[PDB]
């Protein structure tokens, strides 16, 4: 959205002769240059995106209720890892408290 400089209100976007013009309730009118060429957007599979589980994946090595697995961590050589299974495709991620995380992330 575009915020009015004068009154900090949400300006109304209309389209005139091949240009996006924002007009406010206080009469201030501005035209967006490049960053306002986004009429609408949607994101699918929001329930299994990587940005969904960033906090949870970060906290997984410290949560005591997560399933562990007997595998060596290649960074700290700890002999156990934390195994999580996220998404409808059952993506398996192995995480450790040292910062190691399978899938290279």
């Amino acid at each position: 959205m575009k915020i009015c400089k004068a009154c900090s209100s949400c300006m109304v976007r209309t389209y005139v002769d091949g240009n996006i013009i924002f007009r406010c309730s206080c009469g201030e009118s501005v035209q967006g240059d490049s960053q306002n060429l986004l009429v609408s957007s949607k994101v699918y599979h929001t329930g299994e995106m990587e940005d969904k589980y960033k906090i949870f994946i970060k906290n997984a090595p410290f949560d005591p209720t997560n399933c562990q697995i007997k595998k060596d961590c290649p960074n700290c050589h700890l002999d156990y890892l934390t195994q999580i299974c996220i998404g409808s495709q059952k993506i398996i991620i192995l995480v450790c408290r040292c910062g190691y995380m399978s899938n290279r992330g």
Binding site: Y15, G18, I20, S34, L38, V39, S40, S41, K42, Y44
Partner: protein, 290 residues
Amino acid sequence: VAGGTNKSGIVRPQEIFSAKPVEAEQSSEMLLRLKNPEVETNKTYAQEIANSIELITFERLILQWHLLYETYSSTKKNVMYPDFASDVEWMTDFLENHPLLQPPEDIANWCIRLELNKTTMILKSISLESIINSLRAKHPNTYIMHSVENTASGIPIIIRIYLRESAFRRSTNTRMATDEKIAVNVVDKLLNSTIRGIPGIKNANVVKLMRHRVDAQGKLVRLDNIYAIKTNGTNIFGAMLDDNIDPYTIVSSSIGDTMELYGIEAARQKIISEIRTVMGDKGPNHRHLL
């Protein structure tokens, strides 16, 4: 109990007794028999036909879509969204790879940017070329650009659809729709476009069924090696038009759909069949179903 196969506590008997329409059926199914008796002997032939008839709308192949107020000219540098300004690199390749698909002269100030879900394109076995033909065959009032089909992870496949001016010349006499309204209406049409399937069915399985057949010696024998297609969701007319399905022996589980296309006498036989399925085998005599 899951969606599309809800056969939990009384629902299907309620769908029959209340004469609920096909739109309100939570467990509609349909049995399709292959036209060629030789093909129904082989499971692989019936397996690929079953996967052929499965509604893959263009929406489910999309991870995210963006509606942009942009026009594309090959030479003139028009304004472009800063987060998507890198798209111009593969636009030049498209122009030099298709000397016949040049941009029109009536492209409107509306762009739809698409980022295909490459995982779904692999599991469903859908190529980029098939998607392009399906969209260009259904939407003549658009100009479509696409990136290269990449086999390397980390680089997505981008579909870019440009709305022509004729998209609003369809019906703009009804001035109760701003150009933003038509563009939103167009993208809904694009996403709901059918790709590689028939509408109304979400799953199509392969089952083994048993039938009788009179031999050349007049003997009636049970044939056990017969393959057919049992679908989730009902569309008699959709499977009617398919050339791989015998149209004469389409068995729906929907009374309303059978009534619509076959008549009241076939709907009478459909009510009898559907109640008997609910009744199980420890059910009433046949004369109570009539």
